[PDB]
Amino acid sequence: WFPLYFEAECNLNYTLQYVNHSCDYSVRQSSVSFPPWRDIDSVTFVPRNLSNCSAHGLAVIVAGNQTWYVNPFSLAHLLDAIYNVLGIEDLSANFRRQLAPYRHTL
Amino acid sequence: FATADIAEKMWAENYETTSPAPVLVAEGEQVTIPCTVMTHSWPMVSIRARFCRSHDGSDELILDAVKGHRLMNGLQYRLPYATWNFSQLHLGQIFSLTFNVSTDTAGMYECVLRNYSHGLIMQRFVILTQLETLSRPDEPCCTPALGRYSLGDQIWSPTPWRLRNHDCGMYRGFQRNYFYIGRADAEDCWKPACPDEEPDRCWTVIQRYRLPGDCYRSQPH
Amino acid sequence: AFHLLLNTYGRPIRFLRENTTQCTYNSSLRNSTVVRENAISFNFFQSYNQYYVFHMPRCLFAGPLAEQFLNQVDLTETLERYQQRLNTYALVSKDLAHRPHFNQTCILFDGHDLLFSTVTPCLHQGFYLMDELRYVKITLTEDFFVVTVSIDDDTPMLLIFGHLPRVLFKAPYQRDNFILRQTEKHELLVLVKKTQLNRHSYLKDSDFLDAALDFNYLD
Ligand SMILES: *[C@@H]1O[C@H](CO)[C@@H](O[C@@H]2O[C@H](CO)[C@@H](O[C@@H]3O[C@H](CO)[C@@H](O)[C@H](O)[C@@H]3O)[C@H](O)[C@H]2NC(C)=O)[C@H](O)[C@H]1NC(C)=O
Ligand SMILES: *[C@@H]1O[C@H](CO)[C@@H](O[C@@H]2O[C@H](CO)[C@@H](O)[C@H](O)[C@H]2NC(C)=O)[C@H](O)[C@H]1NC(C)=O
Ligand SMILES: *[C@@H]1O[C@H](CO)[C@@H](O)[C@H](O)[C@H]1NC(C)=O
Ligand SMILES: *[C@@H]1O[C@H](CO)[C@@H](O)[C@H](O)[C@H]1NC(C)=O
Ligand SMILES: *[C@@H]1O[C@H](CO)[C@@H](O)[C@H](O)[C@H]1NC(C)=O
Ligand SMILES: *[C@@H]1O[C@H](CO)[C@@H](O)[C@H](O)[C@H]1NC(C)=O
Ligand SMILES: *[C@@H]1O[C@H](CO)[C@@H](O)[C@H](O)[C@H]1NC(C)=O
Ligand SMILES: *[C@@H]1O[C@H](CO)[C@@H](O)[C@H](O)[C@H]1NC(C)=O
Ligand SMILES: *[C@@H]1O[C@H](CO)[C@@H](O)[C@H](O)[C@H]1NC(C)=O
Ligand SMILES: *[C@@H]1O[C@H](CO)[C@@H](O)[C@H](O)[C@H]1NC(C)=O
Ligand SMILES: *[C@@H]1O[C@H](CO)[C@@H](O)[C@H](O)[C@H]1NC(C)=O
């Protein structure tokens, strides 16, 4: 038994097209000053699905109305192991299926 | 990358002649490492650290030799909040690193001239918080005579009058007594956490330096 | 009602099991309610106009595990340069193609360019003897040894064997890198710099360090 959590939402007005050829983790200085999980508002991801200009994937974060883009594969490979060591990887039993394609192919 | 790990080492002739004797400093103090270098041809200068609590290899802070622009920082994982410094002095540049000393931050620090492949060690600083000493059982407690830097191969502390000591059990029959600088709390209240390992990466260098007053310490060959 | 849950703290909510399942209402009842103390979310589309959003026990996810993790990534590093970095490892195999630790603890693999760090109770010593100025030391877990060795102010030579940790690995690329004859029950891990070929001889052939007594007992 564990804590219970979220869902999947439909009918959104916000969309992806805004990037206008913004296709990469263009910000790095923020990386050497990451906000911890304590200070994050939300985190996002896309396997560059809609992008001619991106292929495999990218992710974004917002913290105190502060935002920047970073690639998705390390967290995909990582959070699984983090749960496994914490012993709550079973909670991913369902959403691990959705998250499966988003680890690096090798 | 700006550079790989230093591939071939070199040492200055004054390296051991200019490296000060290891120093003892109380935990939590904001120590700062000085450094001075005359005008050279090396594109890069950098500060090099070796922690001796459960650390291996080396990590580097790389700086632009003239401008002072940071180019790479390997110290981040141990020293997330350390602040560096640079000061072009028409005669010769000055750079430094600052941090709050603690058990996990004690180690050896060296100034290193650098280019993409080559590098030359200038000077070495050894920072410590606790020191090993062995007391024979029935014999009274030893009493070292630490002081300020003075000069020579002598271990020293900037605040010798704040010295305090404690014991951590037995070793081959000897009673292990540890020396440290206190006053971080009122009177004798503060007691440092028990060291977990010895001999450490600091060992070979430190046991080559004497300690004032009568006391016993296992020493290299 | 609202209280502390940390680490593997499923015990309280096992009976205080408040719930949330479905698509609509922007998760207001659970997420916006627990905003009273904390609400942190991940979102991922499943199609145009359809999206999956995760809400988490952010404070519990913000436990000591994340504390240790914080400095362990640069999630802004790129695949091809990851691949280039991989080449720094020798990879000899595929290139050829009452308890004492109750009062002592270790922190391992710090600043490691290709692996993640961790703390553990341990015993950490050397051998009965040492020809000093070439230094070694060892550390132990209950079912796998770990060692390090070098005298040169650079990355040393690392060896590990036993029932090795099942997920401890910094990169996503192929973890299996070792002996054809690997044991039926246990695993080996050795990591060294690429240039070690010039000096390290024992890697080039079968075995090392035993008096013709290699196998662990079983019968
Ligand atoms: C980083 O800086 C070092 C500084 O020594 C560079 O190595 C040096 O390269 C020069 C190239 O001319 C060598 O000088 C030449 O060496 C030989 C032997 O003396 C001789 O044929 C010439 O008269 C001339 O002096 C110099 O010896 C060499 N230094 C050492 C210690 O080997 C190095 O190349 C620089 N790295 C990069 C990537 O530029
Ligand atoms: C770990 O070592 C410590 C050393 O302090 C032991 O704790 C006590 O140490 C004092 C002396 O400082 C002794 O008088 C006590 O008998 C020790 N035990 C207790 C319970 O206070 C501690 O016992 C050791 N633990 C283990 C598991 O070996
Ligand atoms: C957009 O907003 C309008 C106005 O509220 C709404 O009718 C519509 O369903 C929303 N969704 C999309 C995908 O445009
Ligand atoms: C570019 O971004 C704007 C918002 O700044 C967005 O409305 C638009 O869709 C994007 N470009 C295209 C071609 O849609
Ligand atoms: C995008 O997803 C669709 C299926 O929904 C698939 O046909 C397409 O190949 C995907 N593209 C990428 C880059 O994943
Ligand atoms: C690239 O754009 C063309 C033209 O719209 C389209 O046919 C093709 O599927 C696009 N490819 C990707 C990967 O988005
Ligand atoms: C959010 O925006 C406000 C207003 O500009 C600003 O003061 C604040 O620093 C921003 N927050 C972050 C985390 O950057
Ligand atoms: C370091 O110590 C100083 C006082 O010496 C203190 O103000 C500061 O908060 C401490 N922490 C850091 C990260 O410097
Ligand atoms: C360098 O140190 C001085 C004090 O000696 C301080 O005022 C200054 O801010 C420091 N510079 C940097 C870049 O940290
Ligand atoms: C499940 O959630 C509902 C509200 O969504 C709540 O009334 C109920 O008590 C919860 N179940 C338990 C066992 O707490
Ligand atoms: C959706 O939920 C978030 C998180 O609780 C909240 O901040 C936001 O105001 C909500 N938005 C709407 C449109 O209900």
Side-chain angles (χ1 to χ4, degrees), chain A residues 1-5 7-47 49-106, chain B residues 2-221, chain C residues 1-8 10 12-13 15-16 18-29 31-57 59-219:
Chain A
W1 305 268
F2 297 93
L4 292 71
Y5 286 110
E7 56 85 20
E9 60 283 16
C10 197
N11 303 309
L12 174 61
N13 289 104
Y14 169 74
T15 193
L16 186 152
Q17 276 68 1
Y18 79 96
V19 293
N20 287 278
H21 277 287
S22 165
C23 317
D24 53 288
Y25 68 107
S26 297
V27 192
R28 174 52 196 62
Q29 63 294 30
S30 50
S31 189
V32 63
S33 71
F34 268 111
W37 293 98
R38 283 74 177 169
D39 291 331
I40 192 66
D41 310 335
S42 177
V43 55
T44 77
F45 158 79
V46 74
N49 188 246
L50 280 72
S51 59
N52 277 79
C53 177
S54 181
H56 212 307
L58 72 164
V60 189
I61 60 163
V62 63
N65 53 263
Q66 184 270 357
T67 300
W68 84 89
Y69 307 72
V70 177
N71 80 8
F73 303 106
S74 48
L75 62 80
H77 181 74
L78 183 63
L79 277 296
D80 179 33
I82 291 179
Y83 292 165
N84 191 352
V85 299
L86 183 62
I88 61 162
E89 70 277 16
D90 56 342
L91 314 188
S92 75
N94 185 292
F95 73 73
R96 73 176 63 158
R97 298 146 52 259
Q98 295 84 304
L99 170 72
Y102 306 114
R103 273 87 69 186
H104 183 249
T105 53
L106 175 63
Chain B
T3 185
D5 59 356
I6 192 66
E8 61 85 20
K9 325 303 151 283
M10 295 176 262
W11 285 261
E13 57 85 19
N14 274 354
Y15 169 57
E16 69 275 16
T17 304
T18 50
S19 298
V23 65
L24 272 158
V25 297
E27 58 83 18
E29 188 273 359
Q30 192 174 235
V31 65
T32 288
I33 62 170
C35 199
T36 294
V37 56
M38 61 79 71
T39 303
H40 285 110
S41 50
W42 289 91
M44 297 169 181
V45 305
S46 63
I47 290 168
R48 194 167 187 234
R50 288 190 296 283
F51 297 100
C52 62
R53 152 56 186 182
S54 66
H55 176 252
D56 68 278
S58 59
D59 43 358
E60 196 51 15
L61 191 43
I62 309 186
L63 189 69
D64 185 358
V66 55
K67 299 306 306 300
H69 303 310
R70 172 185 59 77
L71 301 181
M72 184 175 286
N73 63 6
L75 310 175
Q76 57 90 27
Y77 63 95
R78 293 290 179 91
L79 277 296
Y81 313 150
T83 291
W84 65 93
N85 222 308
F86 172 86
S87 302
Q88 199 303 315
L89 192 142
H90 184 269
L91 182 138
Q93 291 65 9
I94 307 86
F95 52 81
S96 312
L97 183 63
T98 75
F99 64 92
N100 286 358
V101 55
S102 73
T103 187
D104 63 358
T105 55
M108 308 143 275
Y109 299 90
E110 300 80 2
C111 297
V112 183
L113 294 174
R114 194 74 143 74
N115 65 0
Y116 180 83
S117 309
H118 292 181
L120 183 63
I121 312 305
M122 294 298 102
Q123 198 175 17
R124 181 190 69 241
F125 292 166
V126 191
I127 312 303
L128 301 177
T129 46
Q130 179 269 326
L131 183 63
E132 294 293 328
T133 59
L134 306 177
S135 65
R136 313 271 161 131
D138 182 77
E139 293 81 3
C141 189
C142 49
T143 48
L146 277 296
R148 287 187 287 116
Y149 40 76
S150 182
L151 81 173
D153 184 77
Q154 182 54 264
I155 297 169
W156 63 284
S157 174
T159 58
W161 59 92
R162 286 167 54 182
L163 171 67
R164 289 192 290 113
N165 67 355
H166 75 286
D167 62 358
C168 292
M170 182 179 72
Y171 153 77
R172 301 288 172 247
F174 294 167
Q175 186 168 16
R176 312 166 71 194
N177 175 12
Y178 298 175
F179 293 99
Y180 63 92
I181 313 301
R183 177 54 261 186
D185 291 331
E187 307 180 336
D188 59 357
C189 302
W190 171 236
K191 185 259 158 196
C194 187
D196 290 331
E197 294 297 339
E198 63 82 12
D200 63 358
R201 198 170 186 192
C202 284
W203 195 88
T204 61
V205 182
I206 192 66
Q207 281 81 23
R208 284 205 276 93
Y209 282 72
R210 64 162 291 100
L211 188 66
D214 55 314
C215 53
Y216 190 61
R217 184 180 67 189
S218 179
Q219 64 279 21
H221 295 290
Chain C
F2 310 92
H3 72 288
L4 169 66
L5 287 78
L6 187 56
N7 298 338
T8 311
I13 190 147
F15 49 92
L16 313 178
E18 284 297 333
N19 43 96
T20 175
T21 55
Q22 271 158 14
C23 166
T24 313
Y25 293 99
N26 180 42
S27 80
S28 57
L29 298 179
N31 178 313
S32 312
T33 307
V34 67
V35 161
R36 182 177 290 101
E37 57 263 34
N38 185 4
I40 290 181
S41 62
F42 161 92
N43 57 4
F44 162 57
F45 65 108
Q46 183 49 86
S47 72
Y48 45 88
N49 205 14
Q50 174 54 48
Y51 299 79
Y52 197 99
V53 65
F54 276 113
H55 185 260
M56 284 73 74
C59 310
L60 182 152
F61 282 9
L65 283 72
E67 303 187 333
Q68 163 63 96
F69 162 68
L70 300 184
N71 290 318
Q72 294 184 333
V73 288
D74 172 17
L75 188 153
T76 72
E77 179 64 16
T78 175
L79 280 50
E80 81 298 11
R81 211 60 167 265
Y82 286 130
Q83 151 60 5
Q84 188 274 331
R85 199 161 294 101
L86 311 187
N87 305 331
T88 61
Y89 167 45
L91 184 38
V92 56
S93 60
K94 296 173 174 176
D95 298 11
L96 284 169
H98 58 282
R99 310 195 177 193
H101 71 307
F102 291 171
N103 239 355
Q104 192 267 315
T105 68
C106 300
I107 192 68
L108 277 296
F109 292 163
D110 187 42
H112 195 269
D113 63 358
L114 299 169
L115 183 62
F116 264 60
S117 298
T118 188
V119 65
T120 184
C122 53
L123 193 143
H124 180 57
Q125 288 290 3
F127 179 62
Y128 278 112
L129 307 167
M130 178 171 284
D131 175 27
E132 306 188 329
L133 183 62
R134 46 176 169 165
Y135 187 76
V136 192
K137 206 160 178 186
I138 297 89
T139 302
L140 181 153
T141 62
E142 292 62 20
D143 201 32
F144 64 83
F145 300 163
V146 306
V147 302
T148 181
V149 54
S150 185
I151 290 297
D152 65 337
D153 198 357
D154 198 357
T155 60
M157 284 73 74
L158 277 296
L159 159 68
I160 296 98
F161 170 84
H163 168 281
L164 303 189
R166 301 172 189 141
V167 297
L168 186 61
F169 187 65
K170 179 154 272 181
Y173 315 97
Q174 184 170 38
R175 199 167 187 231
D176 67 85
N177 289 291
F178 297 106
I179 295 141
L180 186 153
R181 322 162 298 167
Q182 190 56 41
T183 61
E184 300 95 315
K185 179 63 171 64
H186 270 170
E187 310 83 56
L188 187 153
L189 182 63
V190 56
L191 210 63
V192 298
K193 184 60 64 68
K194 198 58 142 186
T195 61
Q196 276 280 345
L197 61 95
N198 55 6
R199 81 213 80 168
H200 192 290
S201 54
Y202 313 110
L203 56 85
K204 299 168 180 176
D205 289 273
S206 88
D207 302 279
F208 189 35
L209 303 184
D210 201 344
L213 267 72
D214 76 319
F215 306 118
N216 170 5
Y217 156 73
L218 289 185
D219 73 355

